[PDB]
Design a binder for this molecule. Sequence first.
Ligand SMILES: [Zn+2]
Length: 258
Amino acid sequence: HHAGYGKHNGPEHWHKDFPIAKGERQSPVDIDTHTAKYDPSLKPLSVSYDQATSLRILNNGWAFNVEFDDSQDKAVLKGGPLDGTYRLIQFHFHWGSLDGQGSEHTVDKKKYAAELHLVHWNTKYGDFGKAVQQPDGLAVLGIFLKVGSAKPGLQKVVDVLDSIKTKGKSADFTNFDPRGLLPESLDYWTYPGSLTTPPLLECVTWIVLKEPISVSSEQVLKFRKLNFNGEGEPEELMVDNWRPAQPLKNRQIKASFK
Ligand SMILES: [Zn+2]
């Protein structure tokens, strides 16, 4: 009996096992576009994914992760609010049971159909395990998904989902280019936050892009065919695996644009 996204083990229960759930810098949060202030000190954001090396895709009962080889300095995120180099380790999505919900962060209370999280860790801390124990250990690039035209660069991911339908299943996923999941503009809000799943460590600098990518209804539907459960157990569809907006508390969201 562990945390999850159900009525008896959902986000509202998670504080019992993880007190930090009611912390001072939890995510996600609602982004009030009118209160977010342009920050001149922010340097240009640099997303260098040309040498990215994907290796596997895994259904971990919470989402599916496309894992990358981070044993070396290849796919990195730098600049913006960021000091030093952050290495891409994995990316995953959160999505809903319907197009009207699914994203973790919200924009003026608006909920998107889904949200992509590209997770990177600060190389100054040597490894991901050590990085999550630091306030500036992680940088997560957040990208909203809306339903409309299909995203060509996402189809490769959609096509393998049938092979990792249940919790614990994984499949080879080499040569996938994450650049195909990026929107045209790199305009972003930024604020200090957490992991959005247990253990909810407040080790994350959040970079959330303003421009959404569009995915087809067909692509998201195949998201919704995944299972939270393991092979051979009662089918629980993997839908609404998102944590709701959390109190902003003593934080300010900064904008990279005007
Ligand atoms: Zn996430």
